Amino acid sequence: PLIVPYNLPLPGGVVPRMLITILGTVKPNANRIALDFQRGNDVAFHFNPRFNENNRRVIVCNTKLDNNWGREERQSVFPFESGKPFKIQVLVEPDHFKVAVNDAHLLQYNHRVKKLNEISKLGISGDIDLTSASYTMI
Amino acid sequence: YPATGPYGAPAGPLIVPYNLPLPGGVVPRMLITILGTVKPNANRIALDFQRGNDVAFHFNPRFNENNRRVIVCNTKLDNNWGREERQSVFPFESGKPFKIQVLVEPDHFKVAVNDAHLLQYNHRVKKLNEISKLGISGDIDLTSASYTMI
Amino acid sequence: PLIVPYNLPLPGGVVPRMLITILGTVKPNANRIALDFQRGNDVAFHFNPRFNENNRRVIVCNTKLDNNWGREERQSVFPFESGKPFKIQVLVEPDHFKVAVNDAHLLQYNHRVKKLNEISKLGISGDIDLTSASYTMI
Amino acid sequence: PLIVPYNLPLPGGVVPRMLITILGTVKPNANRIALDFQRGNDVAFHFNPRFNENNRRVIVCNTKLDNNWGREERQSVFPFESGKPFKIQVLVEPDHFKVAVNDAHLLQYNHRVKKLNEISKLGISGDIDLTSASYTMI
Ligand SMILES: OC[C@H]1O[C@@H](O[C@H]2[C@H](O)[C@@H](O)[C@H](O)O[C@@H]2CO)[C@H](O)[C@@H](O)[C@H]1O
Ligand SMILES: OC[C@H]1O[C@@H](O[C@H]2[C@H](O)[C@@H](O)[C@H](O)O[C@@H]2CO)[C@H](O)[C@@H](O)[C@H]1O
Ligand SMILES: OC[C@H]1O[C@@H](O[C@H]2[C@H](O)[C@@H](O)[C@H](O)O[C@@H]2CO)[C@H](O)[C@@H](O)[C@H]1O
Ligand SMILES: OC[C@H]1O[C@@H](O[C@H]2[C@H](O)[C@@H](O)[C@H](O)O[C@@H]2CO)[C@H](O)[C@@H](O)[C@H]1O
């Protein structure tokens, strides 16, 4: 399959109506998953499901500017399950990313990095086996 | 030691940690003067210029960060510290008087220590008028703390 | 009166069966409150109700060793209301602190700083007017 | 060549007298390089040269425990150049990791993670073209 950590090129950027689809299986005893949309020295959009933060599951979203993480956005909705298949979809709008897991709307993160066109890679890491990493331009 | 009376809210003594009120906030050509003595065995000193829930300008002499002396400047937007600015020139010395001056300019804060210029810090918080207070903490005995326009 | 931020001295430390009681009033439009149990250059126990993190109220607890915050322990129970009087009680046990607000038990925080006898100072700050800070030894 | 980010498996963990060698070339217009010795959910040893942090080059070393970085150790000795090859070496000792660049000793980093045998993985990342990554005992 695809090896983790995995890089999905997005040369010529993210653009509105774009749909990133990530399919795979969560490992057993999973601790974490991360999607990292990168722009140059920054991480425009960090989607980080955490399977155990003091015995809560939480999704944390944020932006890294060079070495500094910004304001954390925390969500408790968490459809992943150890040892189970998943589908993560990221829809790009003008003002925000929208994220769905297992065909159901989960969250939105407003853009902090504005130059969408410069977002050139998606890092996919953590305790997953990856089956596919692809995107749709509608 | 708290001074009550008819001239305003109860006032804290000149003992660390201390808030120096800045009514009107800050404006260019403002000059803050701070006099005191560094305690023996100082670990740290800090100046914290505050606006609402942010620290617009944090000036933080550290006397041992892994056996180096370093001044760290930064900004805190409510719970988040941003890009650190580190400098190595460190005039302070344990058990020694000092004078810190902060001149406000439109582009930046200039900081001078013992009559000689030390560093510049560009404004990340732009609404200078909103900067309400100045925190002064750490391992210093404090002697005076005041502002005047120039 | 008591001026905020206030230092309550605990010379000779914190000791099992000790119960700290802080009375006061939350200011209008409060943003934050903080209790900081200090030890030399460390904060052995920071208890930090925040009135707005991304439109949630959360109590954040942690320990600061010199310049580093450790693992956050987050709790969403939050009895404080803007403009209303409060009571914070902190009971010291051999293995943890217990915290209760307005007579309702809130949480436990396990000691990370083990030398309880060196915890000299309790800092009380944020958007409050303070009426009394005292403790009982039982 | 090999593709960044990359995990060098360290089967049977690290153990004194292990010598890890990494060859590559710094990219033009570098910003960062990172070595991440991993144990479960932690980074035992992060070695992070930075080509421009407020117009200063610096190497930051640290340990990550779940989501928390501890105390930073900053060194200003920096032997890397944009476009230039390099040979990074890491010698494991009982008390610390010793690091050499282009066969000249650079720094030490005391162990914070003590169970060396659980350090299962070394992560290589940043603005480089990784040629090889291998180890051997000495
Ligand atoms: O300590 C290794 C770690 O540092 C993080 O950046 C730090 C930075 O060095 C410090 O100056 C700043 O104030 O705090 C940052 C957040 O911990 C990097 O983000 C991380 O990638 C590591 O390199
Ligand atoms: O953990 C106590 C500590 O939190 C700091 O803010 C954190 C914040 O909770 C976290 O979500 C963010 O990503 O990291 C921040 C920097 O550590 C507060 O700034 C500090 O005052 C304490 O309250
Ligand atoms: O940036 C000023 C701010 O620094 C915090 O400490 C930093 C420290 O300088 C850095 O090396 C480490 O990697 O991250 C720490 C936590 O953000 C202090 O805790 C805080 O008091 C301020 O001084
Ligand atoms: O926010 C994304 C960023 O979080 C870092 O972890 C935070 C942690 O969530 C917070 O509770 C604590 O106070 O500060 C940590 C350091 O910023 C992760 O380490 C990083 O990997 C990202 O996931």
Numbering used by the authors:
A (entry chain E), C (entry chain C), D (entry chain G): 113 to 250
B (entry chain D): 101 to 250
From the paper:
Looking at vertebrate adhesion/growth-regulatory galectins, three types of protein design are known: (i) the non-covalently associated homodimer (proto type), (ii) the heterodimer connected by a linker (tandem-repeat type) and (iii) the trimodular chimera, uniquely represented by galectin-3 (Gal-3). It underlies this lectin’s capacity to interact with diverse types of counterreceptors (glycans and proteins).
Lactose binds to the canonical site of each monomer. Owing to this kind of structural arrangement a channel-like cavity inside the tetramer is generated. In fact, additional electron density could be observed for regions of the NT in three of the 12 monomers. The obtained data revealed that the region in the terminal section of repeat IX and the beginning of the CRD adopted a β-hairpin structure. The NTS is arranged in a double-stranded anti-parallel β-sheet.
